[PDB]
Amino acid sequence: AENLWVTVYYGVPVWKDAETTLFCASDHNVWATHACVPTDPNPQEIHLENVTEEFNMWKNNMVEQMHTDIISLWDQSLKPCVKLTPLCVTLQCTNVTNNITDDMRGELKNCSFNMTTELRDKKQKVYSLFYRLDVVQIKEYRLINCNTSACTQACPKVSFEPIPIHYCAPAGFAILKCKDKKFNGTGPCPSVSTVQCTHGIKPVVSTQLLLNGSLAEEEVMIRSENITNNAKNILVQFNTPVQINCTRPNNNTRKSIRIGPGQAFYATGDIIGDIRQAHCNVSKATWNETLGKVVKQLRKHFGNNTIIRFANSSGGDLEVTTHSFNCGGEFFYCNTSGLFNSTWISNSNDSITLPCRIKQIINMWQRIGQCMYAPPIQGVIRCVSNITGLILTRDGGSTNSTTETFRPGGGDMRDNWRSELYKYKVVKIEPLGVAPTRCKR
Amino acid sequence: IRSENITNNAKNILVQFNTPVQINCTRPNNNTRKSIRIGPGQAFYATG
Amino acid sequence: TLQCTNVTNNITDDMRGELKNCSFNMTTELRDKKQKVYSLFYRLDVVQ
Amino acid sequence: AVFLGFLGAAGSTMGAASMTLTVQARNLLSTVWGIKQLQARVLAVERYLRDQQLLGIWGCSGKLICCTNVPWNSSWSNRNLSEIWDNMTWLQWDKEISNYTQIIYGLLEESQNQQEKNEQDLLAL
Amino acid sequence: AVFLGFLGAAGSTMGAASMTLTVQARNLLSTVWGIKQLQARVLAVERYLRDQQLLGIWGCSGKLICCTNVPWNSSWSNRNLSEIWDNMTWLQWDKEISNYTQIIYGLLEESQNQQEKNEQDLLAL
Amino acid sequence: AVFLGFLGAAGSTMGAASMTLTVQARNLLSTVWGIKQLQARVLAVERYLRDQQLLGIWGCSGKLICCTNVPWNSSWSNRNLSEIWDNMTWLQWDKEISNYTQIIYGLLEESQNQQEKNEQDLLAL
Numbered sequence A: 001a002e003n004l005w006v007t008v009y010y011g012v013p014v015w016k017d018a019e020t021t022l023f024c025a026s027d028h029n030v031w032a033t034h035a036c037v038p039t040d041p042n043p044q045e046i047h048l049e050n051v052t053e054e055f056n057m058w059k060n061n062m063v064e065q066m067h068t069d070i071i072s073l074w075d076q077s078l079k080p081c082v083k084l085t086p087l088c089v090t091l092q093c094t095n096v097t098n099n100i101t102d103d104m105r106g107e108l109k110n111c112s113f114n115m116t117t118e119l120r121d122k123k124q125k126v127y128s129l130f131y132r133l134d135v136v137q138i139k140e141y142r143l144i145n146c147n148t149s150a151c152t153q154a155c156p157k158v159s160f161e162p163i164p165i166h167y168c169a170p171a172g173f174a175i176l177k178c179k180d181k182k183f184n185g186t187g188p189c190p191s192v193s194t195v196q197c198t199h200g201i202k203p204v205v206s207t208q209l210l211l212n213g214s215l216a217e218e219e220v221m222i223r224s225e226n227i228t229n230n231a232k233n234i235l236v237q238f239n240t241p242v243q244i245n246c247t248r249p250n251n252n253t254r255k256s257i258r259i260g261p262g263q264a265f266y267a268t269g270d271i272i273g274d275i276r277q278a279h280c281n282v283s284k285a286t287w288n289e290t291l292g293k294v295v296k297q298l299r300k301h302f303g304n305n306t307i308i309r310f311a312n313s314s315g316g317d318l319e320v321t322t323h324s325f326n327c328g329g330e331f332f333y334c335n336t337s338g339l340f341n342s343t344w345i346s347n348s349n350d351s352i353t354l355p356c357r358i359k360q361i362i363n364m365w366q367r368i369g370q371c372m373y374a375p376p377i378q379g380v381i382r383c384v385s386n387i388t389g390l391i392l393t394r395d396g397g398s399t400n401s402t403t404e405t406f407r408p409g410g411g412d413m414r415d416n417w418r419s420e421l422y423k424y425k426v427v428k429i430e431p432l433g434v435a436p437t438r439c440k441r
Numbered sequence B: 001i002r003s004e005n006i007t008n009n010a011k012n013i014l015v016q017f018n019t020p021v022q023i024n025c026t027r028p029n030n031n032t033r034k035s036i037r038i039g040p041g042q043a044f045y046a047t048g
Numbered sequence C: 001t002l003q004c005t006n007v008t009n010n011i012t013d014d015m016r017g018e019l020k021n022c023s024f025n026m027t028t029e030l031r032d033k034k035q036k037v038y039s040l041f042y043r044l045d046v047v048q
Numbered sequence D, E, F: 001a002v003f004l005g006f007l008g009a010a011g012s013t014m015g016a017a018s019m020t021l022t023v024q025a026r027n028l029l030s031t032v033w034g035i036k037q038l039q040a041r042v043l044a045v046e047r048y049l050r051d052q053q054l055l056g057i058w059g060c061s062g063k064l065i066c067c068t069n070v071p072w073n074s075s076w077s078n079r080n081l082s083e084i085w086d087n088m089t090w091l092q093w094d095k096e097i098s099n100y101t102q103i104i105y106g107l108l109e110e111s112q113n114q115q116e117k118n119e120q121d122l123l124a125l
């Protein structure tokens, strides 16, 4: 009666979850755009009507791909640069006692040492200024990295400024984007679209605070893989940014020492004028309003009558314990203790100042045996940035106490990438299909 | 027994057994290893 | 330039002269300093 | 909005979605980064050739809609055309039938050769 | 001389040049230097597959001279066949009509599907 | 044992071996080691495309057993069908007639275009 027969359809709109390799799309720098494809001036997006798709931000392979690509680019950028192997020599250092304040005493050391020259059978005595965090006593000191591995110097021509990069999937695949606001990164998104490439993502490297990120379109958002468990981090996304102004006011001076044939080491000659600590400024009223919004949102998940406490970081390495970032080539590590210090109970122009330090020997990624010696920057430096999110961790959390204490977190760079690719996923099309149909061959 | 040209002496002869023969090799000296740092992140291992 | 001597500590007749106790200078982590060290080498690895 | 285009017919019914197969068909083909791009292009070409070979083996070469001689077994599915071609989406049908895939492929493959043999025999006369 | 072969008919008229399409059809497919050669081969394979797909979508699969159902619009060209197929070369025609290429392709693509649908409807009876 | 499968019909006669062309047809497509694997993969696609183009040019596109118009010359082979299709293997026939391969290819190529031209002429009326 039915008298149906099989029929083959090519081009059926069906997709399945899959993993593949994405490629560049972009408009001297570490994030090499030379080997990256140009971006189309008029990107195209196709909203899918009446299509709901499952999303999970904590199982995205795009984050792993981005991390691997960033690490590979960082390794590639440092290949054609001088190696500071001869620098491992016995230094003779003294305290700097020229126009310093009460907080920067002992932070700088004036060191002298012998060094090689262009000729193989000649030596030269030179001097430099080093930071206390870079020299360890062996009146004799040595670089901290000498007993770990000989490591290189970043070339002065390249720039560390992040550049937006778009990721594009190959032919036969598609990228699905969730346009549903208030989506918390896990569950069924009912508003979906197909995009050839993602939006510009700045690979900003920072810990304890998301800088120059994206803002929520509705209100403060809280995301966590398992909010009940304290071992999983909590990502907070602001709906409005907070301006933070950081500056190093020391007038540094750069000099070049020839350590071999066509090899120069850049040292800090001397500081002109006064010597003062670098510091950052954050608005107080804006920070208070942002924390009010954050605690308001947190009350939804952790009870209505609970007490919400913000305190200092537990401890560990300086990178994880302190807000670490870089501006203009100078690597700042700062003590965000005045911000996350308050308690909240259910019921003008002063600015919070963070005095903080600079480092030159850098281990950016969680790796052992490779440095990155940042050459000094000439003149005073300053910058302004947007705080648009936080990474928080719950301490303890047992049922014995009704008070919840949240502390700053960070360390792993995958969290920074996960905050931008939470609304994206990749699928592969399956054009072939079989159906029943009346006609017969 | 296999050989490219058994008449010619310049070609090797490969003999494949039917059953294996157990051979037990041993070095009975109690060696000790010590690391000497020859540079930044470079160690040479020597018999102490 | 290694300075080597014969080892004569609990050896049999067939293992006489097989091992040489050799001392020498070597570099270290710092390019300024040097360290005197020693090790044991095999007779097949050292030539006068 | 660009609601209609490429995969815009995903949420529509199978009958409505059957009118826009060409938009899906067109896009199936199209220093460290270059290696990844080349690998992806190689994989895409291999997948396209695999799909084309599978289509050609069944005798529906160069056709988007090609119904054939193999009858539909009622065991695989019981729903009638009334509640399928205008009361269901392609994704739902694929999800329901994804278990029963290879048997129909084998049936098509073994059916095509018999037709070829019969055509040769007829042309022999 | 080897006057005839591959592109030897480039200077001839379209009528004479249409007799030797196969010679052009055949040749379309076939440490640091090896990378360049592999890249060139990949690009050539991609171009060949693109051309084959474009031919297949219009229903002229496996054919060198295939006419179709889309009629010719007089606006695109006004010259008649008398002064075209024996008073013009392929290069001149391509130069003249390079502007109006995509519209004909779209018309062919949308025309093929209607024929396929009508054939399915006829075979349904 | 898996006697039947892929190349299991190599020792059988041509008549019996012609019943299992599909199993051979299917398998034709599918850090330092990765480079070698990629180089190997690049060649298989080229070989498959060359074979497909050679088949399509003769007009037997999308067919496993396709007869053509060129007659058989007695000079190339004198044996009759009685002692060929059931008293000989494909390897033996290929070995015997490996010398005379290209001429039939050229004849098929030149014959297909005449049929295409004639079909165009008949459809012109």
Ligand SMILES: *[C@@H]1O[C@H](CO)[C@@H](O[C@@H]2O[C@H](CO)[C@@H](O[C@@H]3O[C@H](CO)[C@@H](O)[C@H](O[C@H]4O[C@H](CO)[C@@H](O)[C@H](O)[C@@H]4O[C@H]4O[C@H](CO)[C@@H](O)[C@H](O)[C@@H]4O)[C@@H]3O)[C@H](O)[C@H]2NC(C)=O)[C@H](O)[C@H]1NC(C)=O
Residues within 6 Å of the ligand: A156, A158, A159, A160, A161, A162, A204, A206, A211, A212, A325, A326, A327, A328, A329, A377, A378, A379, A382, A383, A384, A385, A386
């Ligand atoms: C978040 O975003 C904001 C804004 O988007 C970022 O703030 C911007 O940061 C950049 C980089 O620090 C800054 O641009 C610099 O401005 C300086 C002052 O005008 C310039 O002097 C500087 O140019 C030098 O560096 C370039 C490479 O970056 C060189 O190409 C150039 O030639 C200059 O280098 C010369 O001078 C130096 C110093 O004397 C010397 O050592 C060199 O050898 C050479 O002679 C940059 O153009 C912007 O001005 C900032 N924007 C604002 C509004 O302040 C912020 O950094 C982002 N946050 C994070 C965490 O990245």
Ligand SMILES: *[C@@H]1O[C@H](CO)[C@@H](O[C@@H]2O[C@H](CO)[C@@H](O)[C@H](O)[C@H]2NC(C)=O)[C@H](O)[C@H]1NC(C)=O
Residues within 6 Å of the ligand: A096, A097, A098, A110, A111, A127, A270, A271
């Ligand atoms: C760091 O130490 C060096 C060496 O002692 C200082 O350079 C000397 O500066 C004095 C005057 O301040 C000169 O008279 C000497 O000739 C300099 N020595 C050399 C070798 O040039 C340098 O000024 C010190 N820097 C700081 C910031 O204290």
Ligand SMILES: *[C@@H]1O[C@H](CO)[C@@H](O[C@@H]2O[C@H](CO)[C@@H](O)[C@H](O)[C@H]2NC(C)=O)[C@H](O)[C@H]1NC(C)=O
Residues within 6 Å of the ligand: A090, A091, A092, A112, A113, A114, A125
């Ligand atoms: C640079 O090298 C010179 C010698 O090449 C060092 O001066 C020597 O210091 C040692 C102390 O360990 C004395 O025993 C020598 O007598 C000194 N020799 C001379 C010629 O002065 C000098 O100290 C080195 N520079 C630094 C900063 O240590």
Ligand SMILES: *[C@@H]1O[C@H](CO)[C@@H](O[C@@H]2O[C@H](CO)[C@@H](O)[C@H](O)[C@H]2NC(C)=O)[C@H](O)[C@H]1NC(C)=O
Residues within 6 Å of the ligand: A226, A228, A229
């Ligand atoms: C979120 O974390 C909690 C805490 O670990 C998980 O609940 C625990 O699950 C383990 C699994 O064996 C049990 O042993 C514990 O007794 C559970 N504790 C509590 C307080 O429930 C919970 O399952 C996690 N969420 C998900 C979705 O798995």
Ligand SMILES: *[C@@H]1O[C@H](CO)[C@@H](O[C@@H]2O[C@H](CO)[C@@H](O)[C@H](O)[C@H]2NC(C)=O)[C@H](O)[C@H]1NC(C)=O
Residues within 6 Å of the ligand: A245, A246, A247, A279, A280, A281, A351, A353, A382
């Ligand atoms: C951060 O804030 C401090 C004050 O809390 C600023 O210090 C003042 O800086 C101005 C510079 O124009 C001086 O004129 C004042 O004398 C300083 N006052 C004090 C008390 O230090 C500091 O400049 C701010 N820095 C940034 C980068 O905004």
Ligand SMILES: *[C@@H]1O[C@H](CO)[C@@H](O[C@@H]2O[C@H](CO)[C@@H](O)[C@H](O)[C@H]2NC(C)=O)[C@H](O)[C@H]1NC(C)=O
Residues within 6 Å of the ligand: A243, A244, A245, A281, A282, A283, A351, A384
């Ligand atoms: C961070 O820096 C910006 C720009 O330097 C400050 O914005 C300026 O604020 C002053 C004081 O109200 C105004 O007179 C200027 O007109 C502002 N300039 C711009 C471009 O907005 C900002 O106030 C600083 N933030 C903090 C916390 O010090």
Ligand SMILES: *[C@@H]1O[C@H](CO)[C@@H](O[C@@H]2O[C@H](CO)[C@@H](O)[C@H](O)[C@H]2NC(C)=O)[C@H](O)[C@H]1NC(C)=O
Residues within 6 Å of the ligand: A312, A313, A321, A322, A335, A337
């Ligand atoms: C957060 O605040 C606590 C409390 O002040 C800090 O703990 C102090 O740590 C220093 C060592 O640097 C000690 O000398 C003080 O005695 C500690 N305070 C007390 C009350 O004992 C903690 O260091 C702060 N967080 C960070 C990252 O510095």
Ligand SMILES: *[C@@H]1O[C@H](CO)[C@@H](O[C@@H]2O[C@H](CO)[C@@H](O)[C@H](O)[C@H]2NC(C)=O)[C@H](O)[C@H]1NC(C)=O
Residues within 6 Å of the ligand: A335, A337
């Ligand atoms: C981060 O800042 C806080 C606030 O200034 C520091 O806490 C002070 O630490 C000093 C020790 O250097 C104590 O003498 C003060 O009593 C502490 N103040 C308070 C209010 O507890 C903290 O030490 C800083 N972090 C680091 C690593 O030094």
Ligand SMILES: *[C@@H]1O[C@H](CO)[C@@H](O[C@@H]2O[C@H](CO)[C@@H](O)[C@H](O)[C@H]2NC(C)=O)[C@H](O)[C@H]1NC(C)=O
Residues within 6 Å of the ligand: A212, A241, A384, A385, A386
């Ligand atoms: C910090 O945030 C402000 C507000 O979002 C940014 O200012 C906006 O910049 C965009 C540029 O894409 C403009 O389209 C908006 O009109 C601006 N808004 C306002 C209120 O000015 C600012 O650019 C951000 N700073 C950084 C360094 O990213």
Ligand SMILES: *[C@@H]1O[C@H](CO)[C@@H](O[C@@H]2O[C@H](CO)[C@@H](O)[C@H](O)[C@H]2NC(C)=O)[C@H](O)[C@H]1NC(C)=O
Residues within 6 Å of the ligand: B005, B007, B008
């Ligand atoms: C195996 O080796 C023998 C010995 O070389 C080959 O016989 C020789 O062939 C050469 C070829 O010019 C003659 O000059 C010698 O006089 C031959 N000697 C003997 C003893 O026959 C023999 O040809 C080799 N086998 C094969 C199959 O080539």
Ligand SMILES: *[C@@H]1O[C@H](CO)[C@@H](O[C@@H]2O[C@H](CO)[C@@H](O)[C@H](O)[C@H]2NC(C)=O)[C@H](O)[C@H]1NC(C)=O
Residues within 6 Å of the ligand: B024, B025, B026
């Ligand atoms: C190889 O054979 C020799 C004897 O020819 C073994 O020597 C004996 O080893 C055992 C070890 O348990 C000792 O207790 C005996 O005293 C040894 N006897 C002599 C005469 O040397 C030797 O152990 C064998 N080695 C292996 C690996 O099988």
Ligand SMILES: *[C@@H]1O[C@H](CO)[C@@H](O[C@@H]2O[C@H](CO)[C@@H](O)[C@H](O)[C@H]2NC(C)=O)[C@H](O)[C@H]1NC(C)=O
Residues within 6 Å of the ligand: C007, C008, C009, C021, C022, C038
């Ligand atoms: C190889 O030679 C070294 C140096 O002569 C020996 O080490 C010495 O051993 C004696 C007694 O065992 C000690 O008193 C010395 O202090 C050691 N010297 C050093 C520099 O540590 C070593 O024992 C010899 N090894 C052998 C197997 O003979």
Ligand SMILES: *[C@@H]1O[C@H](CO)[C@@H](O[C@@H]2O[C@H](CO)[C@@H](O)[C@H](O)[C@H]2NC(C)=O)[C@H](O)[C@H]1NC(C)=O
Residues within 6 Å of the ligand: C001, C002, C003, C023, C024, C025, C036
């Ligand atoms: C390690 O170096 C020291 C210093 O160069 C060597 O001792 C010297 O040896 C030479 C040649 O025998 C003498 O001329 C010097 O007078 C020695 N100086 C001292 C301070 O002893 C020593 O021989 C070297 N070690 C080895 C194993 O050769």
Ligand SMILES: *[C@@H]1O[C@H](CO)[C@@H](O)[C@H](O)[C@H]1NC(C)=O
Residues within 6 Å of the ligand: A094, A095, A105, A106
């Ligand atoms: C340098 O100053 C620091 C801090 O006052 C002190 O601990 C150190 O002993 C001083 N070193 C000198 C004077 O060599």
Ligand SMILES: *[C@@H]1O[C@H](CO)[C@@H](O)[C@H](O)[C@H]1NC(C)=O
Residues within 6 Å of the ligand: A147, A148
């Ligand atoms: C290098 O020295 C520091 C301090 O002296 C020590 O903490 C570290 O473990 C040393 N490195 C290695 C590889 O032992």
Ligand SMILES: *[C@@H]1O[C@H](CO)[C@@H](O)[C@H](O)[C@H]1NC(C)=O
Residues within 6 Å of the ligand: A182, A183, A184, A186, A187, A188
């Ligand atoms: C928020 O995340 C939880 C995680 O389990 C999920 O169940 C819930 O549906 C999400 N909220 C929305 C509105 O989807």
